[PDB]
Amino acid sequence: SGFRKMAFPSGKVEGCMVQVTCGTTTLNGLWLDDVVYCPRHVICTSEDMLNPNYEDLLIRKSNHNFLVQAGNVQLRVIGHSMQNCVLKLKVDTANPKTPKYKFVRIQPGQTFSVLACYNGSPSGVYQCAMRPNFTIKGSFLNSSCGSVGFNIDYDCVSFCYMHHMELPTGVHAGTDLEGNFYGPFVDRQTAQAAGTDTTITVNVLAWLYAAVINGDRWFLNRFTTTLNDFNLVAMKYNYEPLTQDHVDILGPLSAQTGIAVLDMCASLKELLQNGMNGRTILGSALLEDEFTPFDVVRQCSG
Amino acid sequence: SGFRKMAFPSGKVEGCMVQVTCGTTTLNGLWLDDVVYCPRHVICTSEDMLNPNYEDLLIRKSNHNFLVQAGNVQLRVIGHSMQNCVLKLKVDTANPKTPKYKFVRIQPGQTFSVLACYNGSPSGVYQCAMRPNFTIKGSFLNSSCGSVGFNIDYDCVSFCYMHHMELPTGVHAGTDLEGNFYGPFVDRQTAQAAGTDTTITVNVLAWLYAAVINGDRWFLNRFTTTLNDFNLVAMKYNYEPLTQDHVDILGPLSAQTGIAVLDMCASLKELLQNGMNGRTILGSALLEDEFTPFDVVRQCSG
Numbered sequence: 001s002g003f004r005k006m007a008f009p010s011g012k013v014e015g016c017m018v019q020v021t022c023g024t025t026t027l028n029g030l031w032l033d034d035v036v037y038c039p040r041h042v043i044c045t046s047e048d049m050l051n052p053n054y055e056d057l058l059i060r061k062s063n064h065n066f067l068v069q070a071g072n073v074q075l076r077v078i079g080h081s082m083q084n085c086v087l088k089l090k091v092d093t094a095n096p097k098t099p100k101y102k103f104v105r106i107q108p109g110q111t112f113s114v115l116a117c118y119n120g121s122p123s124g125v126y127q128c129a130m131r132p133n134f135t136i137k138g139s140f141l142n143s144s145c146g147s148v149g150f151n152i153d154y155d156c157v158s159f160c161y162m163h164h165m166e167l168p169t170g171v172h173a174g175t176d177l178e179g180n181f182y183g184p185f186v187d188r189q190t191a192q193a194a195g196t197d198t199t200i201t202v203n204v205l206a207w208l209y210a211a212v213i214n215g216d217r218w219f220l221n222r223f224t225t226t227l228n229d230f231n232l233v234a235m236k237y238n239y240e241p242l243t244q245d246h247v248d249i250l251g252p253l254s255a256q257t258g259i260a261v262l263d264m265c266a267s268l269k270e271l272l273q274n275g276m277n278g279r280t281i282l283g284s285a286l287l288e289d290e291f292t293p294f295d296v297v298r299q300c301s302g
Numbered sequence: 303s304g305f306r307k308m309a310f311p312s313g314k315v316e317g318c319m320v321q322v323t324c325g326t327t328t329l330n331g332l333w334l335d336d337v338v339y340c341p342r343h344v345i346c347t348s349e350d351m352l353n354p355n356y357e358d359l360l361i362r363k364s365n366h367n368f369l370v371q372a373g374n375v376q377l378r379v380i381g382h383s384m385q386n387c388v389l390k391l392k393v394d395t396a397n398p399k400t401p402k403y404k405f406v407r408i409q410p411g412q413t414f415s416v417l418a419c420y421n422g423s424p425s426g427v428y429q430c431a432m433r434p435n436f437t438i439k440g441s442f443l444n445s446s447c448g449s450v451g452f453n454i455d456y457d458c459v460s461f462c463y464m465h466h467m468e469l470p471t472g473v474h475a476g477t478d479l480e481g482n483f484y485g486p487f488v489d490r491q492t493a494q495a496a497g498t499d500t501t502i503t504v505n506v507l508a509w510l511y512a513a514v515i516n517g518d519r520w521f522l523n524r525f526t527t528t529l530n531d532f533n534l535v536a537m538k539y540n541y542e543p544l545t546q547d548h549v550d551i552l553g554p555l556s557a558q559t560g561i562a563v564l565d566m567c568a569s570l571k572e573l574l575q576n577g578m579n580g581r582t583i584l585g586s587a588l589l590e591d592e593f594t595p596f597d598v599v600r601q602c603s604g
């Protein structure tokens with residue numbers, strides 16, 4: 001038993017990380033087959049950041065303006081194209097450590113593992129959620145760009161995130177691996193803010209189910225509520241509305257514990273209304289929303 | 303910016319996870335060069351969990367009673383020895399994926415990543431601390447045993463933890479990689495309980511320095527303390543005594559912030575009195591004690 005913020009094992013993705021140099025700019029690339037994916041802002045100088053002309057700055061580049069460094073082995077760029085906000089560099093060498101993979105775009109509320117990298121070298125692995133405001137609360141310093149978000153399904157790596165920037169609130173913004181931004185953000189050093197976030201309610205109900213599965217039961221009450229009446233208490237506390245989608249999705253945890261979603265919703269209502277009376281749930285003083293229903297079933301089943 | 307409970311990249315340890323079967327018992331082994339390290343309780347039946355005689359159980363065992371599986375490949379056990387509470391199986395094949403490694407025994411307050419494993423397969427990676435009471439707050443199910451804890455310095459994996467048992471408070475006990483238990487615990491299903499846990503004070507201090515590095519000062523005050531006055535107050539919150547050794551270790555974080563350790567001690571003392579008054583520090587409403595001074599310098603300074 002026990003319940004941790006658990007990351008996916010990172011080995012398949014560590015075998016894919018390279019250093020991409022364009023001029024003085026170094027960041028990370030994902031090397032899959034004979035293509036290296038990286039943020040297009042690698043080609044930007046200091047200047048070329050308030051108003052980058054990407055189409056224009058790209059055409060002024062040769063293949064040999066890009067040094068791609070695969071540990072200590074230098075990869076020769078034999079092609080270059082931009083897809084939205086990712087640069088795709090065709091390399092003379094295919095990655096022998098390429099996993100079973102697809103590119104996937106996630107929803108707000110869905111979780112992933114980040115492999116934080118610097119100069120092509122994996123640094124740390126952590127679990128994140130896509131905030132409803134389409135930011136992630138990562139841990140990213142200078143030269144973290146080209147760090148990727150992933151899920152594993154069996155032996156298949158699902159790449160869902162590439163890291164691009166930090167917003168003034170210390171939160172992070174990026175794209176899928178096709179270079180489409182999550183959220184209303186642009187890859188220019190200009191004034192950008194995170195929108196006001198809300199709490200991923202389905203994830204909190206799923207986290208209370210995890211608490212119950214670990215014999216942490218104190219928050220359980222007698223009230224049954226309606227879906228509407230819980231979504232009215234919820235919207236006052238900046239919680240996401242909970243939809244039948246979200247209720248049917250808690251099925252396996254309601255079955256596992258025998259506790260009906262609406263009985264659990266009546267608990268979280270009471271918790272929203274009061275607080276935790278100097279008690280914790282699974283050793284947190286806050287209502288956690290960065291564990292999906294699949295995360296709780298996954299962890300608890302092994 | 304940002305601050306995450308962050309684990310080492312798991313690939314170098316994922317390269318080492320095997321399945322060890324005995325009769326009906328399957329658990330995890332650590333495959334390094336031509337030896338598999340696993341829990342000696344793999345040789346236990348249903349009966350023998352209470353007062354196992356390990357020397358008498360093992361003498362009855364041949365090399366060929368030990369089924370070691372690396373992915374598909376079954377390894378050939380050509381030797382067995384007992385070292386404390388670990389079983390060592392000499393196999394006919396050196397692991398080609400053996401990373402640079404050492405075995406280290408850690409102290410309470412030290413942090414490590416766990417690769418959670420079932421049947422030699424990886425579940426997940428998470429960050430843990432050796433609690434003052436020689437337990438860890440893990441996430442471990444049936445057949446979790448042999449799952450290991452580790453740190454990585456550059457390219458070297460230092461193995462520090464092997465999983466053996468869950469105590470009745472839902473916390474975890476294990477050995478070093480020489481099979482010496484952390485704490486007073488034994489590999490028997492005898493009545494055992496962890497002693498009352500204390501907060502790792504040097505870690506909470508290190509984490510407050512991390513919050514200041516990240517731009518947060520709200521919790522500081524114009525007061526200082528003596529080390530002794532600090533220890534009289536903190537010992538009333540079930541905080542570990544802070545030593546001069548702990549003061550010395552916080553020295554780099556002090557230099558970086560320009561806040562003397564005893565001034566930050568004064569800060570913690572007031573936080574213990576007042577709590578957070580609806581505020582959070584690095585997204586927590588509790589005082590976080592599972593980041594070392596070293597972990598903070600690692601994530602906030604690189």
Ligand SMILES: *C(=N)[C@H](C[C@@H]1CCNC1=O)NC(=O)[C@@H]1[C@@H]2[C@H](CN1C(=O)[C@@H](NC(=O)C(F)(F)F)C(C)(C)C)C2(C)C
Nearest residue numbers: 041140141142143144145165166167187188189190192
């Ligand atoms: C990645 N390699 C870096 C810095 C990382 C990202 C997360 N934390 C970091 O410190 N990314 C960048 O330098 C990007 C890059 C230009 C500016 N930029 C930013 O992250 C800046 N932020 C913004 O301009 C904002 F707020 F709008 F997002 C910066 C002020 C340097 C943090 C480009 C092309 C967006």
Ligand SMILES: CC(C)(C)[C@H](NC(=O)C(F)(F)F)C(=O)N1C[C@H]2[C@@H]([C@H]1C(=O)N[C@H](C=N)C[C@@H]1CCNC1=O)C2(C)C
Nearest residue numbers: 001343442443444445447466467468469489490491494
């Ligand atoms: C919890 C249980 C009551 C079963 C027991 N605990 C106590 O006997 C104690 F309370 F005394 F410690 C206990 O863990 N074990 C009994 C037996 C080994 C260990 C065990 O079964 N290990 C499992 C590995 N195959 C993983 C476990 C179960 C879920 N989470 C874990 O970590 C040994 C100590 C020899």
